[PDB]
Symmetry: D2
Subunit: 116 residues, 4 copies
């Protein structure tokens, strides 16, 4: 029932990516951003209770994943400064969002699963 | 504690890929393949109790996903005939294997998550 | 001898992604961004002469790809608003960058090829 | 006018994947396979003139990429035994193919670019 979920995997080690820091922001009508939550994945590459339903109204959201610190801690030199995922939420109605992210030092894949 | 799991996602639809048929085969002594299980993904893109521990000793395995029929039914003409994932497994001591698979008509991404 | 190249592919059609608009920006001292180039991919999914040697000093760069319009114009309703790639660029020795991007309605893969 | 090209990239180092051995087979009328070419990528992750026009009729093809040895040659331990890409070719006609392959030790992405 958590409206926004993440699932982060490490494609080098074949494990989830633990202790990846992230920030969730909401777009403002002027095109700026307001931070609504921060979090850190657990050893399963997930975050519980990131945000509540009330904090998640329809609109455009940005999730910034601090992948550079993840790789630096892993002993690898990464390419990207950050990984940002930007999307409109609820352009139709309700439902829950899971942002899947697969990380390599010089690449990432991101997909969404949108369900109800 | 399912020794072999799958998680299939649809990158066009933004949902798990349900009703994907697959076959699990085990490499034999003379280098052939024997089929040891079949299944179809559920609506969460998974197959529960695909094989038992007793059916899964150390060895080389092949999991064949029938992605072409998945796309043909969806109405998209796909590039690949099948998606095959081949790997050496050593499950003894509860090492669990999850094969993740992200599908598009002309591309797939596949990753493994191996427990410790 | 283009310091910065892109290669965008469409994973639904199995063709390069033509007509994708993009913006190249450089991080400024005050932490802001200054746009240094814009373009639209050709039918090979590339943009030649995106920027010159002289406009590519060391520093942080952002390339924003307008993937939403790409999909909506192909008649698909996508997940992401945009796809952003942010990286610190170096090459002291004529080192060049290729940003590869593989697009599906609800997913993208981005990788970098850095020469040397 | 190579009807079949490949492009293999390394997602750990950010370079093309050099010296990857591969084997190309064609599906026979009976459901078997016949080998029609072998090669090794150059440092650009390509193989020039893998096969001729005359060797590439419409039909089902398999490319077996020896990713396991790629990774051990890089000094890493990989998950997959091989990466097989099986696809249907240009019954109508004409059409040329590029198989793109992005490699990480525990993951790969396979896509195709099919151009007239």
């Amino acid at each position: 029932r958590c409206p926004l979920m993440v699932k982060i995997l490490d494609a080098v080690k074949g494990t989830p990516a633990g202790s990846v820091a992230l920030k969730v922001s909401q777009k403002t009508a002027d095109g700026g951003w307001t931070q609504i939550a921060t979090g850190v994945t657990d050893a399963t590459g997930e975050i519980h209770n990131l945000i509540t339903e009330q904090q998640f109204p329809a609109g455009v959201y940005r999730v910034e994943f601090d992948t550079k610190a993840y790789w630096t801690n892993q002993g690898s030199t990464p390419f990207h400064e950050v990984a940002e995922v930007v999307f409109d939420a609820h352009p139709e109605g309700h439902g829950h969002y899971t942002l899947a992210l697969l990380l390599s030092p010089f690449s990432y894949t991101t997909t969404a699963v949108v369900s109800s």
